[PDB]
Write an enzyme that holds these catalytic residues in place. Structure first.
Site, PDB file in Angstrom:
ATOM      1  N   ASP A  34       0.760  -1.237   0.000  1.00  0.00           N
ATOM      2  CA  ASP A  34       0.000   0.000   0.000  1.00  0.00           C
ATOM      3  C   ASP A  34       0.804   1.308   0.000  1.00  0.00           C
ATOM      4  OD1 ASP A  34      -2.271   1.550   0.242  1.00  0.00           O
ATOM      5  OD2 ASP A  34      -2.258   1.444   2.438  1.00  0.00           O
ATOM      6  N   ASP A 214      -2.382   5.627  -5.391  1.00  0.00           N
ATOM      7  CA  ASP A 214      -2.502   4.628  -4.343  1.00  0.00           C
ATOM      8  C   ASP A 214      -2.724   3.222  -4.852  1.00  0.00           C
ATOM      9  OD1 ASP A 214      -2.904   3.209  -2.073  1.00  0.00           O
ATOM     10  OD2 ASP A 214      -4.438   4.529  -1.221  1.00  0.00           O
TER      11      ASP A 214
END
Ligand SMILES: CCOC(=O)C[C@H](O)[C@H](CC(C)C)NC(=O)[C@@H](NC(=O)[C@@H](NC(=O)CC(C)C)C(C)C)C(C)C
Length: 329
Positions: A34, A214
């Site tokens: 992430d 992201d």
């Protein structure tokens, strides 16, 4: 291949995981790499929560490298919350290891249904030190200092279920992944890998929107108003009170996103932000687009974007490189 790679695997044809271990002994776990967070946590052998039963747990006592800490922590995510405490040990990503500080999670109740319903064990943050809790320097950054990698940059070539696996390349750009020229966009802040682009959809324009790259967001986030105005004359159906938008995958009115800077323009057309919903109904699709407002008009260019564009995350140069990913390695 002079740089540290990490094979990524397709998860439900939308997300993806990668592996990495903790402790001087292997102790492998499956992570969600992430870039939208700056903390690395992992299920502790001490977890008492139900979501841990299906997972791989961390045994600090079976690692000569462990280094007690105990300060409690709470990792907060838009999707859930995780509890535990800090601990330190040898984290091995790819063929590189380094004594890292992480969270040993013991309570995963605030991260459901997601956690129990998913195959990953923990999350590996790839953001900036400032996004981290307990001020931890990015992993890739540490590795650089320790001359473990040439330059502090990591690359993302998202996979495709049956076409090819993906890769999280560390400390080096490999052309194998992209075709065409890389274009760099400086970060407007050293927090998330956030850059500034103009967001143009159809007749709608949001100038200098904050665009967050992201890998941990399975969708494309769009500010609420922008989204509403966007779906007006489109023949899309938002099921009442649900962030559920359905269309004929063939709907000819669906727009192509267009993000532009002075160095380049990146587009994301229907084929990229549409998810097939065949079992629901024939020739039916959902948008995989979410209405989400931040303090400042922000777009989260999640997986759907990265699946189309190979991405380079430069810490040393504080910027993001973008280029079309090879349809196949
Ligand atoms: C420092 C905190 O960092 C962040 O808050 C953002 C993280 O990257 C985080 C990832 C961690 C939660 C792992 N992202 C999210 O919470 C996003 N969630 C998702 O993309 C999930 N997808 C869905 O729920 C599907 C809808 C979007 C259709 C995915 C995790 C399953 C939200 C911002 C949307």
């Amino acid at each position: 291949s002079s740089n540290d790679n990490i094979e990524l695997v397709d998860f439900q044809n939308i997300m993806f995981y990668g592996d990495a271990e903790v402790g001087d002994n292997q102790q492998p776990f499956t992570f969600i790499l992430d870039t939208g967070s700056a903390n690395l946590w992992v299920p502790s052998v001490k977890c008492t929560t139900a979501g841990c039963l299906t997972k791989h747990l961390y045994d600090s006592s079976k690692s000569r490298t462990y280094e007690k800490d105990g300060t409690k922590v709470e990792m907060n995510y838009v999707s859930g919350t995780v509890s535990g405490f800090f601990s330190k040990d040898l984290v091995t990503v790819g063929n590189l290891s380094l004594p890292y500080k992480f969270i040993e999670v013991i309570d995963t109740n605030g991260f459901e249904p997601t956690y129990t319903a998913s195959t990953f064990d923990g999350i590996l943050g790839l953001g900036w030190k400032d996004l981290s809790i307990g001020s931890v320097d990015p992993i890739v950054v540490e590795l650089k200092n320790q001359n473990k990698i040439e330059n502090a940059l990591f690359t993302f070539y998202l996979p495709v279920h049956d076409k090819h696996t993906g890769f999280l390349t560390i400390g080096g750009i490999e052309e194998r992944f992209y075709e065409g020229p890389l274009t760099y966009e400086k970060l407007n802040h050293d927090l998330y890998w956030q850059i500034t682009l103009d967001a143009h959809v159809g007749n709608i324009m949001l100038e200098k929107a904050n665009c967050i790259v992201d890998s941990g967001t399975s969708a494309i986030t769009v500010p609420t108003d922008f989204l509403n105005k966007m779906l007006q004359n489109l023949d899309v159906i938002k099921v009442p009170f649900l962030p559920f938008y359905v269309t004929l995958c063939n709907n000819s009115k669906l727009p192509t996103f267009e993000f532009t800077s002075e160095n380049g323009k990146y587009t994301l057309e229907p084929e990229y932000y549409l998810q097939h919903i065949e079992d629901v109904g024939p020739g039916l699709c959902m948008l995989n687009i979410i209405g989400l407002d931040f303090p400042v008009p922000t777009f989260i260019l999640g997986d759907p974007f990265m699946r189309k564009y190979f991405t380079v995350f430069d810490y040393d140069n504080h910027s993001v490189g973008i280029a079309l990913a090879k349809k196949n390695l």
